[PDB]
Amino acid sequence: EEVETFAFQAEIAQLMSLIINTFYSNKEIFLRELISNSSDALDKIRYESLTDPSKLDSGKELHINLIPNKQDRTLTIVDTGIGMTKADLINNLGTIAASGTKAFMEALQAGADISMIGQFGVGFYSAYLVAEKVTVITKHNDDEQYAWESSAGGSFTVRTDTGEPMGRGTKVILHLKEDQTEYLEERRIKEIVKKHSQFIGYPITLFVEKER
Numbered sequence: 001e002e003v004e005t006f007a008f009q010a011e012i013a014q015l016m017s018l019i020i021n022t023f024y025s026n027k028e029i030f031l032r033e034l035i036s037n038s039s040d041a042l043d044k045i046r047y048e049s050l051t052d053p054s055k056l057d058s059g060k061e062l063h064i065n066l067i068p069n070k071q072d073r074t075l076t077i078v079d080t081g082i083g084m085t086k087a088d089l090i091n092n093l094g095t096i097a098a099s100g101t102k103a104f105m106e107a108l109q110a111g112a113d114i115s116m117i118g119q120f121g122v123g124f125y126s127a128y129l130v131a132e133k134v135t136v137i138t139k140h141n142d143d144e145q146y147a148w149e150s151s152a153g154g155s156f157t158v159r160t161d162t163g164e165p166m167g168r169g170t171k172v173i174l175h176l177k178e179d180q181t182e183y184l185e186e187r188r189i190k191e192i193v194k195k196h197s198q199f200i201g202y203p204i205t206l207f208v209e210k211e212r
């Protein structure tokens, strides 16, 4: 064992349905949101590194990398943001998902734009437009490396990660649905980034696969 299982609060099934009923026609939006979250965590590490530059001992470069993988049908997004404790992980993907689902629904119900999804703390869930399963590996300076995983049903799991150590930051791996392998194409990824994340204040690098 050492795997812990968590039940989503009921708002999550509502979230998933809202997301389909708001972004199904524009699925590419998930990349904007993930990049955006990466940007946020980058902002936090930059910020605390000003008061204490030892915060950057775990890695100085502040960036975002995008790693398609046609062979695995995965798209992974890596950042060296501040990363998450176990409690941040559970808090952001669980507690705040559910309270932010409610706030977002109330905001749309009063005519706010859907493009607001990010600001209600549930942008990440848009990932399930394109992915049957998502894994979030994260590592923050005051804590171990954790893996979070969910197919967005009723539960999510947390375990201590024993995989390749990142030094600090967050990795989201998307296991793409059969019908969404367009998100593994170099051309497509470049477009989406160009369109949605042009003004992100941190280098976003696409890692190309070779022919072999």
Ligand SMILES: CCNC(=O)c1nnn(-c2cc(C(C)C)c(O)cc2O)c1-c1ccc(CNCC2CCCCC2)cc1
Binding pocket: 034, 036, 037, 038, 039, 040, 041, 042, 044, 079, 081, 082, 083, 084, 085, 088, 092, 093, 118, 119, 120, 121, 124, 136, 138, 169, 170, 172
């Ligand atoms: C305790 C401090 N740690 C972090 O905050 C952190 N560290 N890594 N990430 C992070 C999280 C995700 C998602 C899986 C939630 C991500 O895709 C990339 C990340 O760097 C985060 C992270 C956590 C939450 C968010 C969401 N912020 C939304 C918020 C809404 C209101 C306006 C300001 C921004 C974005 C990034």
